């Protein structure tokens, strides 16, 4: 088994202390209620489209919430 998200809170990682504090503050969600990120923050995590449009899981901060809103308002909108 590989452990991605379990690690980012360790002391040997380089994430800033405030970033760890919030990544701890957010309570996860069990797999049964997993897909509800596309719609809402699920215990503090959403998915957003990349610049390639492909999804990315991010902690639901004010910044990434604005990102989400812009995705479904500005960039989804066509070229002209």
């Amino acid at each position: 088994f590989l452990f991605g998200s379990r690690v980012m809170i360790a002391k040997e990682v380089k994430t800033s202390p405030d970033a760890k504090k919030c990544i701890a503050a957010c309570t996860g969600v069990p797999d049964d209620k997993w897909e509800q990120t596309y719609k809402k923050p699920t215990g503090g995590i959403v998915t957003v489209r990349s610049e390639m449009g492909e999804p990315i899981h991010k902690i639901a901060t004010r910044g990434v919430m604005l990102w989400k809103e812009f995705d479904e308002t500005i960039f989804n909108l066509p070229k002209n």
Partner: protein, 159 residues
Amino acid sequence: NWLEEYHPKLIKNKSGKIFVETKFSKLIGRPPLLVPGMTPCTVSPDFVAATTNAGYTIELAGGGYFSAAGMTAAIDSVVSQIEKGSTFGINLIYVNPFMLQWGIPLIKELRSKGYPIQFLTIGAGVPSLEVASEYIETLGLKYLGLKPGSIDAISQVIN
């Protein structure tokens, strides 16, 4: 019978250290846990050394280095910190061919130079039968690690 064929065994080492012997842990002589490549997280060469000193296999975040010389300085910076004979591996992205135009022509050499980089991992995609062919013999890697995300990406690695 998969319940017995791959039963998770237990192993004692001469030092008296316990181990979870699996098929995977029996190539790496290391617990069957690893940290995947993480461009914000496993890019910091001092952290990728801190865990491999704990004795857990790690991938080095390739996507965090925009060059060939930068990741080389990272590699050598961890080599300066890992214990004698320790090992790590690197993680490459596949949707980023500019990321792949450094590593491969670099990995061939640092391996021919003999670095402790003893596995590769092509994340965010699966190569073709043709390009995924030379990574195991031109690259003196111990094993290769492919990230399936699809149901056909698994058929592909089986190919």
